[PDB]
Design a protein around this ligand. Structure first.
Ligand SMILES: CCCCCCCCCCCCCCCCCC(=O)OC[C@H](COP(=O)([O-])OCC[N+](C)(C)C)OC(=O)CCCCCCCCCCCCCCCCC
Ligand SMILES: CCCCCCCCCCCCCCCCCC(=O)OC[C@H](COP(=O)([O-])OCC[N+](C)(C)C)OC(=O)CCCCCCCCCCCCCCCCC
Ligand SMILES: CCCCCCCCCCCCCCCCCC(=O)OC[C@H](COP(=O)(O)OCCN)OC(=O)CCCCCCCCCCCCCCCCC
Ligand SMILES: CCCCCCCCCCCCCCCCCC(=O)OC[C@H](COP(=O)(O)OCCN)OC(=O)CCCCCCCCCCCCCCCCC
Ligand SMILES: CCCCCCCCCCCCCCCCCC(=O)OC[C@H](COP(=O)(O)OCCN)OC(=O)CCCCCCCCCCCCCCCCC
Ligand SMILES: CCCCCCCCCCCCCCCCCC(=O)OC[C@H](COP(=O)(O)OCCN)OC(=O)CCCCCCCCCCCCCCCCC
Ligand code: SF4
Ligand code: SF4
Ligand code: SF4
Lengths: 386, 45, 318, 95, 176, 154
């Protein structure tokens, strides 16, 4: 028999809409054919009509649960082509908010996974924590989600006075919140029945199918771009990479919960090691000058005028730059033709290859398991469809 | 004027817990079964 | 005076169901670090009234039904049967004192699956019929352990009269000698009433595109009242079965207060459980019944046949 | 009589609440599966032996307790054997 | 550096085996989960009493747009079109000509608030603090047309909100 | 006469705005802010706006995200299956009028080309509080309805 899954659950859900065409024999799933493009918005074409600065907000809206991490990936790619370097304080801020963003993503990933499986309550507890982290976003950028804060050259503005104290107070209590979540799920026999030995993927298959992030580490592969190909100041912080052993949904859930704990561990070092200095590269042909300078110095006014109309030119070249985003390897293949607008911008969304493996991972499972497998991949269709 | 920007306090922030903490509670397996069986015996009597 | 008595049973049941919806939302709210209804009336006390009026003036869904007779029968059967299960309940005096009241409740509840079957049959949608058949198969499976557990407990009571369970528990609650049966009884009522973590009908229909309501807002509210009337009734029965309340013949109202409190707490535990666990997979709750509860219930049924004989604690026949 | 009157009231009210709920709001203008058959059949066969067990609270009053206990246990054991047979023959599987 | 999340050997001694049998039969870890939800029942909820209580915001908040003036009442905007050039959504439309007194001023200044992405690039680009994103976020409308702001609407927004806008800029301008 | 019709309108309007069951089309990032409106700080349930509502039990559709051409027929179908009275809240720039993707070949330039819209909530995304302001604004729109007053004068 043939069956089509609903676009989305009957409670608020923010992953997007999916048309899943399935072939069933009794309870068992024999074929899965995801039909995507329901949130395809031609982002990659629109970027070709934007300057490099104008295109930056598009990356907030890809994996719109990991906004600043997507900003970081694009900023690093442009900085590489520009051959410039963001100042050390900006790099620490980018790592600090990169890990705050990882917490935001992992709360959404773990709790909506549970919510779709029927465990509603943890979503409410942990989204109060998300609400407090939205306030950190809003205090640095003026926006709760699409901050547009991390830019090529550094960050847009320095932290307001008193923000780091508040991030410390939040971080001080967060591990307790994780513990409460683990009390509800980790040892629960119903949760384990829904996740243990579900969606097993071998280490060999995970690599060939293009998987990344937790979808690799759940199968025992020892890989994390923050460790192996570090960017910004990730080489200066200490943390452990959680590794699974069974390659199933339960191990991937444990990996995500432990990654949240390591993110707190990294945030702690960032709060203590934050250096002084400027927060964007001191090159006014790339980063706009301070407003006081723009209103006093002739050179500053010209460069402000040109950076906000033409934008900076980027030397011709192509780069593939990737980061360890919360959902996996997030990269951009960015082509510059020498002008102030990118010639081509291909976005590599980790969820694209993960969803392409849904049919492989769902073989020999039941219909209700398909919901669990989609959750364990942590799919957001803004990044899948672009 | 001195430079003034958001910085950590002198000496840094206090420690931040991050490791899992699920405390052990309750009796052992023997003790729980004994309590359950003793309750049945009193009920039967 | 009897017709008055029936009304003083029916009308309070429907009001309790109406306000159970408010209590469920607020209890779930506070376990979720929020509040739940607190605007529509003080502390949300008018929320059930607003919901009721809204649902009954909603445009009725056009019924593309393949069987008009069975389409109207199902809600009548569901609501009529739900109200019928209350007439032998001793609170402490039943409306109808039945000698075989336990069998009446067992027999009437076994008919409840006809509303599930007739509604899906009338839906004129293959998806609705499959869901109805899945819901029936889960219901009848857990009827098996409910019946055997009930029989086992009656071997300490000696009678099929519900009022005799009050006498049986005059010194001690039956939960003490029968807590293993109480635990499986409690879970079985959850699965019988399709309550979370056994709410597979709501769970499965969410996934399947094409498994819809098929009843207009008003008629669908009648199904909801029947379901919640059953949820309260099953928890009143659980209190009578395992937490017997002492009856003072000269102060019957004292019994009613204490037995009402126990029923409320048991009903709230249904909400407590809904807030705490993920949902079972369909094959997993069938294994819980056929491979776990049923083997244990059979062994415990054998035990409770033998125990009164070997202890010389056989209850009186009358 | 009292019982029939209670039954009539309950279903008559249900019929009334359904008829007006089906009519008054209309005034406001604007792949057969063998596994599922076998669970039903298994329920039936277990339901029949539950019927044979219902009189047990009355059977325990007999002066012939030796026979009564043997037959009661014999019946429940044959139920356990029925479940064991289905179990070992994969009659309780879903895959 | 790495760690194992699920690589543990259960002990097979009788005491440990009976601890797991007790958990299986007596539902101990399920009871534990009920304890957690019960404790939340008795916690103060996090809910605020909107619209009588409001969520906290910062001076940097990006809300409804407004066009500002100098203390004398003259418009700050001199129709340079930097905001229109930078706008990532092409939400801004400007026309200008010499004013009767010779001033360089706009005759059209439109923001399509349904094209706008509320990014704040316009106020970054503006050299004279003319276009800002104000603190207001409660301006939902019943029609689409009401969200196509022209210059009069934006100037009225500036005159309506200047008291708050000026204080917020005073609070954040040293970070810019 | 007019007094009885006036109060009946108040009663039915009160019931409907007090029991607004929303169907959320969580299309993109705006759905995240919608989830935060359900989260404890705002708790839309406390206004009578239930968390989980089936499309056939819904009174208001919230379009929370970009509407693509590929998705537009499915959104219209869900709207057509909604029993009346039914209202549509357009949330965010994409749903309001295309937003950042207005000039895309694959995007509907505003969901009001597919369905009638009652409330437009601006922002990218609107904050959870701004969405809640919009829902409260829809409630006051329902409060102003005079359905029976119009019917009486027909
Ligand atoms: C069956 C009996 C139905 C009882 C009707 C209960 C009406 C209660 C009510 O309207 O609350 C007062 C309501 C509450 O006012 P409100 O709903 O407009 O706003 C209250 C204030 N906030 C929302 C900020 C919390 O008063 C009215 O608005 C007038 C409507 C009266 C409807 C009754 C018709 C007679
Ligand atoms: C229990 C089950 C029963 C519960 C009651 C439910 C049925 C109530 C009656 C509803 C039908 C009334 C017919 C009105 C006809 C009419 O005037 O035209 C409609 C007119 C139609 O407007 P129109 O005539 O201008 O036409 C509209 C324009 N066209 C035709 C182009 C679409 O107004 C309405 O639509 C609203 C009518 C609301 C009716 C309110 C009835 C009184 C209040 C009811 C309270 C319910 C209490 C429930 C208590 C809790 C449950 C027990
Ligand atoms: C002197 C000699 C006397 C002779 C008699 C002696 C008796 C000794 C034996 C005593 C212990 C018997 C206990 C009987 C209870 C049933 C036990 C049981 O069935 O648990 C197993 C079941 C499945 O668990 P699982 O981990 O999957 O096991 C693997 C199976 N392959 O697990 C479950 O059922 C879990 C159910 C999940 C849903 C639960 C949701 C609610 C849980 C909280 C409710 C708490 C109970 C409240 C009771 C209220 C009663 C009014
Ligand atoms: C493990 C978590 C549980 C999860 C499952 C949910 C279980 C919920 C249990 C709810 C019922 C608990 C008991 C309610 C206490 C109310 C007691 C009361 O009101 O009356 C006092 C009573 C003692 O008196 P009584 O019950 O009449 O005993 C006479 C013997 N026939 O009682 C004396 O204390
Ligand atoms: C205190 C005094 C006593 C002290 C000493 C203790 C004595 C009593 C304890 C010893 C009794 C012997 C233990 C027998 C249990 C072991 C049976 C077994 O191992 O079966 C498990 C397995 C089913 O498991 P499953 O995963 O679902 O499917 C097979 C996949 N490998 O394999 C199977 O296929 C199971 C098929 C048969 C299942 C039997 C079901 C019988 C029905 C329940 C009857 C219970 C008793 C009567 C009531
Ligand atoms: C319900 C109200 C919440 C109570 C607080 C929860 C709690 O403290 O229980 C935790 C306790 C420890 O269990 P656990 O950590 O899972 O380790 C294995 C067993 N020691 O686990 C327990 O001790 C729970 C014991 C449950 C006893 C069985 C209840 C049967 C109910 C029918 C009688
Ligand atoms: S906030 Fe951004 S999108 Fe909106 S008008 Fe200003 S520059 Fe354009
Ligand atoms: S608002 Fe500012 S940036 Fe835009 S045209 Fe006027 S002066 Fe130039
Ligand atoms: S309006 Fe903004 S937040 Fe909402 S879906 Fe569009 S881009 Fe995302």
């Amino acid at each position: 028999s043939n069956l089509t899954l609903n676009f989305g659950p009957q409670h608020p859900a923010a992953h997007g809409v999916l048309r899943l065409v399935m072939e069933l024999s009794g309870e068992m799933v024999r074929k899965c054919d995801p039909h995507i493009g329901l949130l395809h918005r031609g982002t990659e074409k629109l970027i070709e009509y934007k300057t490099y600065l104008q295109a930056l907000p598009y990356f907030d809206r890809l994996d719109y649960v990991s906004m600043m991490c997507n900003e970081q990936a694009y900023s690093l790619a442009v900085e590489k082509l520009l051959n410039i370097r963001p100042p050390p304080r900006a790099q620490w801020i980018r790592v600090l908010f990169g890990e705050i963003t990882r917490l935001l993503n992992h709360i959404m990933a773990v709790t909506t996974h549970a919510l779709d499986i029927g465990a509603m309550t943890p979503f409410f507890w942990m989204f109060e924590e998300r609400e407090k982290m939205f306030e950190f976003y809003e205090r640095v950028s003026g926006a709760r989600m699409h901050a547009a804060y991390v830019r090529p050259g550094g960050v847009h503005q320095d932290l307001p006075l008193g923000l780091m104290d508040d991030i410390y107070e939040f971080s001080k209590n967060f591990s307790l919140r994780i513990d409460e979540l683990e009390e509800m799920l980790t040892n629960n026999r119903i949760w384990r029945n829904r996740t243990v030995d579900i969606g097993i993927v071998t280490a060999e298959d995970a690599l060939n199918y293009g998987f990344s992030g937790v979808m690799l580490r759940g199968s025992g592969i020892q890989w994390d771009l923050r460790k192996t190909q570090p960017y910004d100041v990730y080489d200066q912080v200490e943390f452990d990479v959680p590794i699974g052993s069974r390659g199933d949904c339960y191990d991937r859930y444990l990996c995500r919960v432990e990654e949240m704990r390591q993110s707190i561990r990294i945030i702690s070092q960032c709060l203590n090691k934050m250096p002084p200095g400027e927060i964007k590269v001191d090159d006014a042909k790339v980063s706009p000058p301070k407003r006081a300078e723009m209103k006093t110095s002739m050179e500053s006014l010209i460069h402000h005028f040109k950076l906000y109309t033409e934008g900076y030119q980027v030397p011709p070249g192509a780069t593939y730059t990737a980061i360890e985003a919360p959902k996996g390897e997030f990269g951009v293949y960015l082509v510059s033709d020498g002008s102030s607008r990118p010639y081509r911008c291909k976005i590599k969304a980790p969820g694209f290859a993960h969803l392409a493996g849904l049919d492989k991972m769902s073989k020999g499972h039941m219909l209700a398991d398909v919901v669990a497998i989609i959750g364990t991949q942590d799919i957001v269709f803004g990044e899948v469809d672009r | 004027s001195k430079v003034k920007q958001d910085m950590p306090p002198v000496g840094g922030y206090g420690p931040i817990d991050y490791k899992r903490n699920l405390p052990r509670r309750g009796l052992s397996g023997y003790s729980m079964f004994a309590v359950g069986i003793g309750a049945l015996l009193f009920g039967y009597w | 005076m009897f017709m008055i008595n029936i009304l003083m049973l029916i009308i309070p049941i429907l009001l309790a169901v109406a306000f159970l919806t408010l209590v469920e939302r607020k209890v779930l709210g506070y376990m979720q670090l929020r509040k739940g209804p607190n605007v529509v009336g003080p502390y949300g006390l008018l929320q059930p009234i607003a919901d009721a009026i809204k649902l009954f003036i909603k445009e009725p869904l056009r019924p593309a039904t393949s069987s008009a007779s069975m389409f109207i029968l199902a809600p009548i059967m569901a609501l009529g049967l739900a109200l019928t299960m209350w007439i032998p309940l001793p609170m402490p005096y039943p409306l109808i004192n039945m000698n075989l009241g336990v069998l009446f409740m067992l027999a009437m509840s076994s008919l409840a699956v006809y509303s599930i079957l007739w509604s899906g049959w009338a839906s004129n949608s293959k998806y609705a019929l499959i869901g109805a058949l899945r819901a029936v198969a889960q219901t009848i499976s857990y009827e098996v352990t409910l019946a055997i557990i009930l029989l086992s407990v009656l071997l300490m009571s000696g009678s099929f009269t519900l009022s005799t369970l009050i006498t049986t528990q005059e010194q001690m609650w039956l939960i003490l000698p029968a807590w293993p049966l109480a635990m499986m009884w409690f879970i079985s009522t959850l699965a019988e009433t399709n309550r979370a973590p056994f709410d597979l009908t709501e769970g499965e229909s969410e996934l399947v595109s094409g498994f819809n309501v098929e009843y207009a807002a008003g008629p669908f509210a009648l199904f909801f009242m029947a379901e919640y009337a059953n949820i309260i009734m099953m928890n009143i029965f659980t209190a009578i079965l395992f937490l017997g309340t002492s009856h003072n013949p000269h102060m019957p109202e004292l019994y009613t207060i204490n037995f009402t409190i126990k029923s409320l707490l048991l009903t709230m535990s249904f909400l407590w459980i809904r807030a705490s666990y993920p949902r079972f997979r369909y094959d997993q709750l069938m294994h819980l019944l056929w491979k776990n509860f049923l083997p244990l219930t059979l062994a415990l049924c054998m035990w409770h046949v033998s125990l009164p004989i070997l202890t010389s604690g056989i209850p009186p026949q009358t | 009589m009292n019982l029939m009157l209670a039954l009539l009231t309950n279903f008559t009210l249900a019929t009334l609440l359904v008829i007006i709920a089906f009519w008054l709001p209309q005034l406001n203008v604007y792949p057969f599966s063998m596994k599922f058959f076998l669970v039903a059949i298994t329920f039936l066969l277990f339901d029949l032996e539950i019927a044979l067990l219902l009189p047990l609270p009355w059977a325990s009053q007999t002066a012939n307790l030796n026979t009564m206990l043997t037959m009661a246990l014999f019946l429940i054991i044959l139920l356990a054997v029925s479940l064991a047979y289905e179990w070992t023959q994969k009659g309780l599987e879903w895959t | 550096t790495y760690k194992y999340v699920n690589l543990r050997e259960p002990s097979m001694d009788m005491k440990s085996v009976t601890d797991r049998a007790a958990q299986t039969l007596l539902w101990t870890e399920l009871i534990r989960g009920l304890g957690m939800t019960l404790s939340y029942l008795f916690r103060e909820p996090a809910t605020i009493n909107y619209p009588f209580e409001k969520g906290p915001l910062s001076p940097r908040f990006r809300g409804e747009h407004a066009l500002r003036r100098y203390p004398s009442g003259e418009e700050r905007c001199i129709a340079c079109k930097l905001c229109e050039a930078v706008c990532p959504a092409q939400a801004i439309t400007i026309e200008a000509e010499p004013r009767a007194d010779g001033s360089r001023r706009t005759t059209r200044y439109d923001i399509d608030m349904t094209k706008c992405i509320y990014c704040g690039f316009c106020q970054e680009a503006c050299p004279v603090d003319a276009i800002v994103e104000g603190p207001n976020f409660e301006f939902s409308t019943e029609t689409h047309e009401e969200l196509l702001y022209n210059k009069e609407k934006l100037l009225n927004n500036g005159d309506k909100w200047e008291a708050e806008i000026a204080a917020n800029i005073q609070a954040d301008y040293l970070y810019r | 006469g007019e007094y009885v019709v006036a109060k009946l309108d108040d009663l039915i309007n009160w019931a409907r705005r007090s029991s607004l069951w929303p169907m959320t089309f969580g299309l993109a990032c705006c759905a995240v802010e919608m989830m935060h409106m359900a989260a404890p700080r705002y708790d839309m349930d406390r206004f009578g706006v239930v968390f989980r509502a089936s499309p056939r039990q819904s009174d208001v559709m919230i379009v929370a995200g970009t509407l693509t051409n590929k998705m537009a027929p499915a959104l219209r179908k869900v709207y057509d299956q909604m029993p009346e009275p039914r209202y549509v809240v357009s949330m965010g720039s994409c749903a309001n009028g295309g937003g950042y993707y207005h000039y895309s070949y694959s995007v509907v330039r505003g969901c009001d080309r597919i369905v009638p819209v009652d409330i437009y909530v601006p922002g990218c995304p609107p904050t959870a509080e701004a969405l809640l302001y919009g829902i409260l604004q829809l409630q006051k729109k329902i409060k102003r309805e005079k359905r029976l007053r119009i019917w009486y004068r027909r």
